[PDB]
Design a protein around this ligand. Structure first.
Ligand SMILES: NC(=O)c1ccc[n+]([C@@H]2O[C@H](COP(=O)([O-])OP(=O)(O)OC[C@H]3O[C@@H](n4cnc5c(N)ncnc54)[C@H](O)[C@@H]3O)[C@@H](O)[C@H]2O)c1
Ligand code: NA
Length: 167
């Protein structure tokens, strides 16, 4: 029983972490696709896919979730939304259920015949990439929004300096 979760993870935050843990209570393995893998260095998508692979790896590891329970697969975006479900399928192991709070993702997988679950949002007003990046830019408390392993990654790659320069 394998689930699928798609997210840009810009950057991976505590909301992503909560949702993943609960998904792991109902599936054996979780495929985690890092969407928009071709985008980096913009205010909306600051981090490369590879930096995001590291954030994920360190966070899940820090929280003791064994690697054999999930897959991390970067997925570039494509021009045709009508082909995107097939694009994900092509790049991943087979899966039984899809988890997403994104309307487009929900609708595409639904039209393709998949049951889609929209888990309850964990602290939706603070746990969002938008809020994290807004705090990094305006000097607010972004660190408390992310697992500490992710903050370490962001420090090592000079993420704040990057985003501020870009803005
Ligand atoms: N044609 C295409 O190329 C196409 C079509 C559809 C989607 N996509 C890609 O899908 C990706 C989009 O993922 P996104 O925008 O939803 O990323 P995101 O990182 O903002 O959200 C990831 C998912 O994590 C969960 N989540 C996030 N915050 C949460 C919180 N506080 N509490 C609980 N759960 C929470 C939700 O399931 C959410 O949909 C993008 O890369 C997008 O480009 C591509
Ligand atoms: Na994000």
């Amino acid at each position: 029983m394998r689930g699928l979760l798609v997210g840009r993870m810009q950057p991976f935050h505590r909301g992503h972490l909560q949702v993943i843990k609960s998904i792991l209570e109902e599936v054996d393995e979780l495929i985690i696709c890092i969407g928009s893998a071709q985008l980096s260095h913009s205010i909306r998508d600051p981090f490369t896919a590879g930096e995001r692979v590291m954030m994920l790896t360190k966070a899940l590891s820090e929280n003791g979730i064994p690697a054999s329970r999930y897959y991390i697969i970067p997925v570039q975006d494509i021009e045709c939304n009508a082909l995107w479900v097939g694009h994900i399928k092509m790049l991943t192991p087979p899966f039984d259920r899809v988890y997403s709070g994104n309307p487009l993702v929900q609708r595409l997988f639904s039209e393709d015949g998949y049951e889609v679950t929209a888990p309850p949002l964990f602290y939706r007003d603070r746990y969002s990439g938008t809020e994290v990046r807004r705090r990094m830019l305006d000097d607010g408390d972004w660190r408390s929004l992310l697992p500490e392993s992710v903050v370490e990654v962001i420090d090592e790659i000079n993420g704040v300096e990057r985003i501020k320069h870009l803005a």
